[PDB]
Amino acid sequence: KSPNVLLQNLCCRILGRSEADVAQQFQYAVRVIGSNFAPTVERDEFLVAEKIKKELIRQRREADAALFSELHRKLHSQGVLKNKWSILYLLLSLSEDPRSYATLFAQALPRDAHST
Amino acid sequence: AAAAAANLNAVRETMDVLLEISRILNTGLDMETLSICVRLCEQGINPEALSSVIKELRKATEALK
Amino acid sequence: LWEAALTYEASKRRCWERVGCPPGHREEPYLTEAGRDAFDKFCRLHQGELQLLAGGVLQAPQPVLVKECELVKDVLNVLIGVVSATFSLPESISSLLSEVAEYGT
Amino acid sequence: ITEAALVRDILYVFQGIDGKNIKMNNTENCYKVERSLRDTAVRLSELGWLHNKIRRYTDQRSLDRSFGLVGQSFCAALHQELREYYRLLSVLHSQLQSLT
Amino acid sequence: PDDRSWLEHHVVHQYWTARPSQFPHSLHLHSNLAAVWDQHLYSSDPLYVPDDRVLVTETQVIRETLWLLSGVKKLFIFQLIDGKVTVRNNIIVTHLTHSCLRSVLEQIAAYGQVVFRLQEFIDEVMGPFRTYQAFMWALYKYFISFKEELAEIEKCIINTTITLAIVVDKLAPRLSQLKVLHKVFSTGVAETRNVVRASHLLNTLYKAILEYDEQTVSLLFSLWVETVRPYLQTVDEWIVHGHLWDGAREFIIQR
Amino acid sequence: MIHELLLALSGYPGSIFTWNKRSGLQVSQDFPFLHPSETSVLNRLCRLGTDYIRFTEFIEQYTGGLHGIYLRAFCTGLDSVLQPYRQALLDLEQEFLGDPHLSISHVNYFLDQFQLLFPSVMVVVEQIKSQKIHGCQILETVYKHSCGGLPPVRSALEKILAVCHGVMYKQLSAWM
């Protein structure tokens, strides 16, 4: 598939409507995703790994934090996920709890100190 | 063929391991929506853009609920 | 495309001879636990054995044909009395076929 | 010398068992490598040194039935915590195949 | 090609027919043990004389074993040394060293010997005694229900991989009732007159019921009824007909 | 290597781990293809299996001298306590067949829980062997040891005691 109709499928998934009932949200999606396509910051899978760890310590789950580390082992045993950093950074950003500073935690380096 | 169905095995496994990772972090995406997002992530795409659009669209299906 | 194909099926048996997530391929049940291919093949091979042990002077071809329903129609009509290429005035079917052909004659 | 041997050895001295190129040359001292990588091991070997004390203690006092209901219930807690540490160690072994 | 391929499929043809094991097998350590042990022997410098046996997989032994335990026997696994079933040590599996294999197959052959002696008893009345003849029908009634369960399990192999340690524990509440009978009938297989050979057979069951006065006890009870069955007939006959006229009798008391 | 092992720890020792009644399940061949330290771990794990082998032999004969209906009621509860040591040997093997990176550490971790249940019941079986305990005084040395100090043997021995008391309600029912 071309990427644009894949963004179209995504906007048909979250919303219950089709793309004959809305064209502003999908145009907003093509506005933001386009010209900011394909990662330009640090993309090691270790950096995002230490932040889902940070989250499961804060939820007081030590069994799930070590269950994850074996789910993290299986991704490395197979090795079929092409961008291991991105889809986990995405799932980390959409996290919510089941139930002062924070910029001194790990942040992906921006890479404007290097011409890329 | 066969080894391309063994590749289908190594993708059907990973699609369940991420499904465990999705529920322990309790993201709102079910397996169908996550299926669009993993194909997007294969092509190379900024999660800092995508999470903003998902947090935008989820803010418009609870505003038009 | 890949998650369309992802929903494929696989066997219950897991290999004791492959490790690394075998999806299995089923060791194929015994020959007396199959039939109407294996039954026909068994009949054909025994018939060919008999032909070799004679020299070709015996001649029983057709390891299949006749099936059940056509023979049942012919035997329903032989009690009226009819001739064909099956009546005149598998291989064990000759034993059952004579006992009910002679009834109609 | 390669890094892989030390990484595979050091995950066993946390149980308190010597590796191949990691040996304990003195009882009082913690686990020693047999240059900077050699220096790194001192902070990691403190864990195996501390582990030996609790493990030896819940070995002896658990099967001491003149040590009372309290003390064997103490051993239960100590042994179960050492168990949850072995849970961690099992994962760390499995994530090999060298890891720093 | 057309008949050999169908044959190669259905009948496995690697442990009763000289043809090595053919499979898309790769085997990683968890089951690759026998090759690993042979390589360990070679690295430890024998030096020569390899270990070569006919090489079966695991699930095949399971199907064979279920068939043995139902009450039919003679397979290509399990050689007889006087008629007692024991491990055929010309067959190796892809794992289990050939020595641990020896132990696990030894336990199941130890179970199979008891079923062999019970089946030879059932055979020795069909080629009457009127007590042995009445005992084999009870033994037969147990074996019918046993064989049905084992045959239905075999169908679910065609539809699933199973190993030896599963089928021993799965069939525990039947092999447990049989182990008690292995102690009771061993004194009931020690046979002058036909009425004392019936009394000594009947009395071991009579004492084994009072010993456990449980699920093996209902087995002993159902077996005891089927050999007090001739005695009730003869005692009724001695009373109401005014005579009992049988050879030396089927009742203990003589006139 | 774990199908020999999860059968060596049960009642099938093999030529590698040599069973003995003075101390069984000892390695007789050091494998160079394994890690050098792992063998020590294995021997520690092997301790558990030695007890399970001895426990089976005592149950194999049963079900004045040591014999009676009491010894066939101790064994009956000993069956039920030993059942999650049979199931936990098959379930691991089911896990191992797909996953290739898994190791001995998982088994050591998971079968650590019976090195508190098994040794505190080992003295109970050894005492009934070493003393002439076949009478009505068997229930005393169960009910004195059932108080325990550890939670597995705290709840285990009561299940065993129930069967022996159920035997004591067959004599005392025909009596009474």
Curated annotation (Swiss-Prot), chain C:
Stretch forming the signal peptide: none
Protein name: Gamma-tubulin complex component 6
Source species, domain of life: Eukaryota
Organism of provenance: Homo sapiens (Human)
Role played: Component of the gamma-tubulin ring complex (gTuRC) which mediates microtubule nucleation. The gTuRC regulates the minus-end nucleation of alpha-beta tubulin heterodimers that grow into microtubule protafilaments, a critical step in centrosome duplication and spindle formation.
Portion of the full sequence shown: 282 to 405 of 1819
Subcellular location: Cytoplasm, Cytoskeleton, Microtubule organizing center, Centrosome
Disorder cited: Microcephaly and chorioretinopathy, autosomal recessive, 1: A syndrome characterized by microcephaly, cognitive impairment, underdeveloped retina and choroid, and epilepsy in some patients. The more anterior parts of the retina, near the periphery and pars plana, have a grayish hue and diminutive vasculature similar to retinopathy of prematurity. Visual impairment becomes evident during the first year of life.
Family label: Belongs to the TUBGCP family.
From Swiss-Prot, chain D:
Domain of life: Eukaryota
Membrane spanning residue stretches: none
Expressing tissues: Ubiquitously expressed.
Location of the protein in the cell: Cytoplasm, Cytoskeleton, Microtubule organizing center, Centrosome
Function text: Component of the gamma-tubulin ring complex (gTuRC) which mediates microtubule nucleation. The gTuRC regulates the minus-end nucleation of alpha-beta tubulin heterodimers that grow into microtubule protafilaments, a critical step in centrosome duplication and spindle formation.
The family this protein is said to belong to: Belongs to the TUBGCP family.
Subunit structure: Component of the gamma-tubulin ring complex (gTuRC) consisting of TUBGCP2, TUBGCP3, TUBGCP4, TUBGCP5 and TUBGCP6 and gamma-tubulin TUBG1 or TUBG2. TUBGCP2, TUBGCP3, TUBGCP4, TUBGCP5 and TUBGCP6 assemble in a 5:5:2:1:1 stoichiometry; each is associated with a gamma-tubulin, thereby arranging 14 gamma-tubulins in a helical manner. Gamma-tubulin at the first position is blocked by TUBGCP3 at the last position, allowing 13 protafilaments to grow into a microtubule.
The name this protein goes by in its record: Gamma-tubulin complex component 3
Organism: Homo sapiens
Organismal lineage: Eukaryota, Metazoa, Chordata, Craniata, Vertebrata
Segment of the intact protein contained: 245 to 363 of 907
UniProtKB/Swiss-Prot annotation, chain E:
Source organism superkingdom: Eukaryota
Cell compartments where the protein resides: Cytoplasm, Cytoskeleton, Microtubule organizing center, Centrosome
Residue pairs linked by disulfide bridges in the UniProt entry: none
Tissue: Widely expressed, with highest levels in heart and skeletal muscle and moderate levels in brain.
Subunit record text: Component of the gamma-tubulin ring complex (gTuRC) consisting of TUBGCP2, TUBGCP3, TUBGCP4, TUBGCP5 and TUBGCP6 and gamma-tubulin TUBG1 or TUBG2. TUBGCP2, TUBGCP3, TUBGCP4, TUBGCP5 and TUBGCP6 assemble in a 5:5:2:1:1 stoichiometry; each is associated with a gamma-tubulin, thereby arranging 14 gamma-tubulins in a helical manner. Gamma-tubulin at the first position is blocked by TUBGCP3 at the last position, allowing 13 protafilaments to grow into a microtubule.
Role according to the record: Component of the gamma-tubulin ring complex (gTuRC) which mediates microtubule nucleation. The gTuRC regulates the minus-end nucleation of alpha-beta tubulin heterodimers that grow into microtubule protafilaments, a critical step in centrosome duplication and spindle formation.
Family: Belongs to the TUBGCP family.
Name of this chain's protein: Gamma-tubulin complex component 5
Originating organism: Homo sapiens
Span covered, complete protein: 210 to 496 of 1024
UniProtKB/Swiss-Prot annotation, chain F:
Functional summary from the UniProt entry: Component of the gamma-tubulin ring complex (gTuRC) which mediates microtubule nucleation. The gTuRC regulates the minus-end nucleation of alpha-beta tubulin heterodimers that grow into microtubule protafilaments, a critical step in centrosome duplication and spindle formation.
Assembly and interaction partners: Component of the gamma-tubulin ring complex (gTuRC) consisting of TUBGCP2, TUBGCP3, TUBGCP4, TUBGCP5 and TUBGCP6 and gamma-tubulin TUBG1 or TUBG2. TUBGCP2, TUBGCP3, TUBGCP4, TUBGCP5 and TUBGCP6 assemble in a 5:5:2:1:1 stoichiometry; each is associated with a gamma-tubulin, thereby arranging 14 gamma-tubulins in a helical manner. Gamma-tubulin at the first position is blocked by TUBGCP3 at the last position, allowing 13 protafilaments to grow into a microtubule.
Residues spanning the signal sequence: none
Family, per entry: Belongs to the TUBGCP family.
Tissues expressing this chain: Ubiquitously expressed.
Name of the gene: TUBGCP4
Subcellular location: Cytoplasm, Cytoskeleton, Microtubule organizing center, Centrosome
Interval of the full protein contained in this chain: 1 to 191 of 667
Name of the protein described by the UniProt record: Gamma-tubulin complex component 4
Domain of life, source organism: Eukaryota
